[PDB]
A paper describes a structure:
SulE, an esterase, which detoxifies a variety of sulfonylurea herbicides through de-esterification, provides an attractive approach to remove environmental sulfonylurea herbicides and develop herbicide-tolerant crops. SulE catalyzes the de-esterification of a variety of sulfonylurea herbicides, such as MM, BM, SM, TM, TrM, EM, and CE, to the corresponding herbicidal-inactive parent acid. The structures show that SulE is a dimer with a lid loop in a domain-swapped β-hairpin covering the active site from the opposing monomer. SulE shows a similar catalytic triad consisting of Ser209, His333, and Glu232 at its active site.
Author numbering:
A (entry chain A): 12 to 360
B (entry chain B): 11 to 360
Amino acid sequence: KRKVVLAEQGSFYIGGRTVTGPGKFDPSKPVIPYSNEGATFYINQMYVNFQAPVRPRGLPLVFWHGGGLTGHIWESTPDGRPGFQTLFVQDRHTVYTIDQPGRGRGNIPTFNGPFGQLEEESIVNTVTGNSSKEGAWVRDRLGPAPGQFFENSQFPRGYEDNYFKEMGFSPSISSDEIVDAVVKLVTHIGPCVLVTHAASGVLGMRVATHAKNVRGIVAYEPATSIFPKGKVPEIPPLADKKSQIFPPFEIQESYFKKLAKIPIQFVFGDNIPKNPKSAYWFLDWWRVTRYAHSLSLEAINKLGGQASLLDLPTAGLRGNTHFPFTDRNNVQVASLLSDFLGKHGLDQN
Amino acid sequence: SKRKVVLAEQGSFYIGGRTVTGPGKFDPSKPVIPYSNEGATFYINQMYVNFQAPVRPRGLPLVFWHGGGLTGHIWESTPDGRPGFQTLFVQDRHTVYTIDQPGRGRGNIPTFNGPFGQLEEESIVNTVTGNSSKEGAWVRDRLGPAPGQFFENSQFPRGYEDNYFKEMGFSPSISSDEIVDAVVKLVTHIGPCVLVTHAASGVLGMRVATHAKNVRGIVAYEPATSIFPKGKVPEIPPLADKKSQIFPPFEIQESYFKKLAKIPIQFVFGDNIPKNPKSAYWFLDWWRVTRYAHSLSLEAINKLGGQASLLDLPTAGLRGNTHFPFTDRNNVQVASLLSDFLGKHGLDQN
Ligand SMILES: COC(=O)c1ccccc1S(=O)(=O)NC(=O)Nc1nc(C)nc(OC)n1
Ligand SMILES: COC(=O)c1ccccc1S(=O)(=O)NC(=O)Nc1nc(C)nc(OC)n1
């Protein structure tokens, strides 16, 4: 189950821009400590890893980590079982895994001075934000409160430290520049399928509207819904009657209509309440966010699309967290992804 | 195929680090976003580790440790897309570990809710960062004497400058002790192994070896900081500008320094390091004096009974290497010299 035969593997950087400091560079003057004087800095570039099997069949898969994550989540589970990278190379697909700008091996744009500041210009904010272990525990639905598990949980218990260690902050790079890097990658790859997660859900939808090479999307628990501009439906507040889900992203209808031209599947795990749950903010947030996505998919289908919501419990898989692809039953989750690819001919040459 | 690789297994994991906490208690009924430090536990300073194991490995696993401002990418591929040392050594029948050290790449960057690096009133890392420019890296890496220029003999993959410089970035002010600690923990997990280091990780790998008997050999590509027994640093001249000095050598207690005499150690240097003072080119002159300091460090290990050597790539018949010989155009020939070192010491046999 662990063996993999690669025709080739490697990694590269793509996307990004440059910014420049003031003045000139004199190679005769001390280079350390480093200075912005005469400086060119490459910023906002993305890291890309690829592994290609012998005799690939179908389109390459581009696995795009969720918020605060890296391509690690597709390589291995926290307890060291094979991730989707290995499983899909074994399923005969070329597999690309990225670290988006601002995350992991992607660029974090900072210079000589306060974080993110190039002289007078703020490239990214000096003040950061970052979830705690406790916030991630409830966001990911391991259980209703930190340290508590749902009885049915598929989480690899005992490997909590390993799991939370994979998460971190993201600097305030604009979403436009993140989308731009992935559009450039899709242009480089050719026809492909995006497999997204959480924060990369809305970003992958945007990429597809800019890149006809995206031939399908599977999004694991996307975090932000998308609608045509001016056509956001009524979405309730949370059960606390004060909080809202993430403001839906709005795009011009001419771009939104491109989503109707490819198969799209959103995949949700378990333990999302059907009814308001004021005691558990993130559980209630997932209830309303899932509802908003159901409306987003319906809007795509009213434009002639083929956009579906797969609830893993309906497929017979119980207890999945917000990371179904690293849960204990991730092989069965992968089988459902192979099923989607096969139905839509994305596993054939 | 030159690109074909057969893995018995591959994967990645996190190791090392500690936790820090914010004040107060976490209430799951209160809005979790925007993120707060209240009731928070944060995992900080952990390291990312990737491994690829061949079918039936022969000899010790290799741990490739990137230089300053880099990541494990530099061992995966060259800027122009040729195989890196990860592929070459898996093909050479060694299990290969590649790390992103704490503060770099997939390793943790310790920041929270607040100004960068600050957890309430505690400064975990500095808010003010430092980072080289393209121009600083060009001369540090000896592509040529000035940005845009290449040495006549250059092995750099010319035309792929954008790819190359895009791989570099800043490092937060994590203590070197905590970086060493994470790698010591990895070495405990792996068992007997060989460290292959680069630039900034040179001195760190020497330190790891003094804390971890499982390090059975070191190959260091152009280490940046020299190491000596405490209060035994030899006289080292200032640079030709009569103002600058090399990096202050690291000093360790002699009982730890002596551990370096028990294992084979090779430092590898590329080309275009001047023999004589060069006041017009600061980094070239810096490399001249830094290489000299390393020659004295290796001599101090040998005087204690060690097995330390300096491999100048031009003396081995390889001309034009930069500060990254393992991604240069002749990196296959550089790899053959690493295989030679491993074979000489039996580190390629079980
Ligand atoms: C791994 O799971 C997630 O990606 C994820 C999933 C659900 C909620 C939060 C996150 S996240 O915090 O970690 N990433 C994210 O999308 N956060 C976010 N993004 C935007 C654009 N705005 C706001 O605040 C309004 N928060
Ligand atoms: C890949 O090349 C190198 O690794 C490398 C190579 C040559 C010089 C410098 C570096 S470095 O940029 O990372 N720095 C390093 O080794 N640590 C460090 N950094 C600074 C800024 N100051 C001091 O001490 C004053 N030490």
